[PDB]
Subunit: 133 residues, 6 copies
Amino acid sequence: RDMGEPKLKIVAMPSDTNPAGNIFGGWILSQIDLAGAIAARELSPERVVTISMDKVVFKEPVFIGDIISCYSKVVNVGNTSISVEVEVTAQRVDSQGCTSCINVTSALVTYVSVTRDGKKNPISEELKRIHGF
Amino acid sequence: RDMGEPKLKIVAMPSDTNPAGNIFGGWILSQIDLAGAIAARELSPERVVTISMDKVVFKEPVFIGDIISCYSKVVNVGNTSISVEVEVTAQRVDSQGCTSCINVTSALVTYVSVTRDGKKNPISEELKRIHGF
Amino acid sequence: RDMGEPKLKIVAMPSDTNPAGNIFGGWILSQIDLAGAIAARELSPERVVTISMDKVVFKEPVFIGDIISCYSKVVNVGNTSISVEVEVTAQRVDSQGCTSCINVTSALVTYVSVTRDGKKNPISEELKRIHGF
Amino acid sequence: RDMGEPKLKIVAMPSDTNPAGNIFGGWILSQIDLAGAIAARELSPERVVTISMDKVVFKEPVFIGDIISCYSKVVNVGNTSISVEVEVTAQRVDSQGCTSCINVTSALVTYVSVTRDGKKNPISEELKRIHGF
Amino acid sequence: RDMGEPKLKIVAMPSDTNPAGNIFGGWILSQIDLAGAIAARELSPERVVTISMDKVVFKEPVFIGDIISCYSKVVNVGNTSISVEVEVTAQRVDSQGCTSCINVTSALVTYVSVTRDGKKNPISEELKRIHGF
Amino acid sequence: RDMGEPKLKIVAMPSDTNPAGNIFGGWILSQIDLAGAIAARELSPERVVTISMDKVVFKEPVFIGDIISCYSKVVNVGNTSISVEVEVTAQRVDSQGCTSCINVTSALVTYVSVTRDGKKNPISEELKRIHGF
Ligand SMILES: [Cl-]
Ligand SMILES: [Cl-]
Ligand SMILES: [Cl-]
Ligand SMILES: [Cl-]
Ligand SMILES: [Cl-]
Ligand SMILES: [Cl-]
Ligand SMILES: [Cl-]
Ligand SMILES: [Cl-]
Ligand SMILES: [Cl-]
Ligand SMILES: [Cl-]
Ligand SMILES: [Cl-]
Ligand SMILES: [Cl-]
């Protein structure tokens, strides 16, 4: 971890649980999709649409009260496509009062850079240059 | 398509949109996670926990008003793990009054079969037998 | 039960509860209204508006985790109006691991067939014919 | 109208709409179920469970921004059951700046008076007496 | 208390809680903002926008099941601005069956009277006159 | 601005709007309450309860799509109480593709440091020392 500051930071609320009582995986995946998009828009400011998700791993349960931080690293840039590794950490306090930070979920999301009306937008070589591509 | 009847069937509501106006991908992924789980619990009735997601593809936009159907096929069964292909279709009516059914998203989700308190539960050979494994 | 496959199929989530801890009746009624509408639109593809509800019976409590299936039967068709019986079943697993399916709620909903801009649309005699009217 | 002050008073928010853009009927029915319950608990303070709904009429569309008021009249009291007429009004401002109040929906809801753990509670003759029964 | 009837009256639902299990303060503040606005629009029917909040006090916890009533008093009127004191009460039933009404939160909210497109609207001297200003 | 990194960072979604179409002030206030709490818990790890809010200013409208960042500065520490200035910024892209960052709302929130069961917890002098008090 050293992939910048979080793109998203949310509290997990009691309304975001699954029938077992843990934070619903679909709520996490929502955070991932949104956090990745913020990262991808650095290469495509107006709009991106999510085209795929690979290698998502639910490493650890998320609980009510966790502060969830979503970190992003743009991993790949094509002509219009943008790949983002998203790492989710949960910040948690136990009974004794100790703060733990747990790497909780992981994903590889791909976006396409588009015009605000949804047509393919080739990514500018300048933004690629300032991002190491 | 012929992977049984849908495991989930929901209407996409105006509250489930993204900033562009299409149905939010994270809402779809929630449907996928839940629909896969219903399929996986056929091999593990009490509880499953979602451990991973691969090969999710947002093939087509989802709109307000779409009836979303989530179909599932258990693709693989291990000692405790269960793989599920989830296919999402949107049922849609155009201006002229024509109903279209669009294969809208796709995913491969993996679950672990667990006790209601979250400990690994080896899948019974009987349920594997009646499901073709 | 033999009124086709479900028009809706949803999981009851912890966020859908009432102050007592059972699944909120208003959430169920939402499912009923939506499931009936899908059935009514078979006679009026573009749009229906809900005009009334009769004979709704909360036969049994709904719990967190239940898979709720909403079945529909078009009971009556007028010149513009459409009556639908909606039956809700909850699929549930007990402690020992046994799956139970409980007829949980019931309703008679009436819709009017309208244009996408909300004006009365007389139902086509063809759609009435292919639905036994 | 003169059935006391409203049991519920809510603003209809943009998130409470149906695919057409009007306020979702299921959201209204939620308000009705809750408003009726407040009225029924005057005869059964601890808890009521909703057992049925009759004669619900969607007289008029509800829009974003409407202030919805739910009025209640206990219509009938049995040994454990309580019938409530619920009337919903929408308070609305047009383009010119004129406030209109529209009787928007109607329902007859029945509740059973129960103990906080859900067992039938015979209604006290005193509360019946002070409510005209 | 004698500042008219409530401008809002809602049930606090289990989905409106914070990680501790009490009703989330932000949900209450939403009720306050909306209830104040209804009061302010008596001086500006079309639209108000919220410009500030002072002197909000969380006097007492709010619980699941509470009937929350929001009372309002227009405290001050300027050329375009409107100040509103909002008082929130929770109606609650204990174990023995006793109803308690608790003054639960307090706030001073300020609104600006605007045109439906958001430009400053000077408040009419007539509406000021009929409201004691 | 230089009060550390954001305590919260969320996207404003279409479901978070008011009847006018701007992001609902109550949704913002929720973000403020939560972001302040994260800051206050640095002085009281287990739990804080929100006791008051002063000097909240809605400086600018928030729109759908904005990335909202909530910054916090602990302004004052008493024996059990904690004051936090919360500043909200909206990150926004216009038509031409230009990113703007707008200071959008402001608040002074006060928390009490409590035990996980809600009793007053005197703040440790050590945590005060490492935070400049
Ligand atoms: Cl889950
Ligand atoms: Cl999109
Ligand atoms: Cl999306
Ligand atoms: Cl889980
Ligand atoms: Cl209920
Ligand atoms: Cl409608
Ligand atoms: Cl509707
Ligand atoms: Cl109940
Ligand atoms: Cl709170
Ligand atoms: Cl506004
Ligand atoms: Cl607002
Ligand atoms: Cl609290």
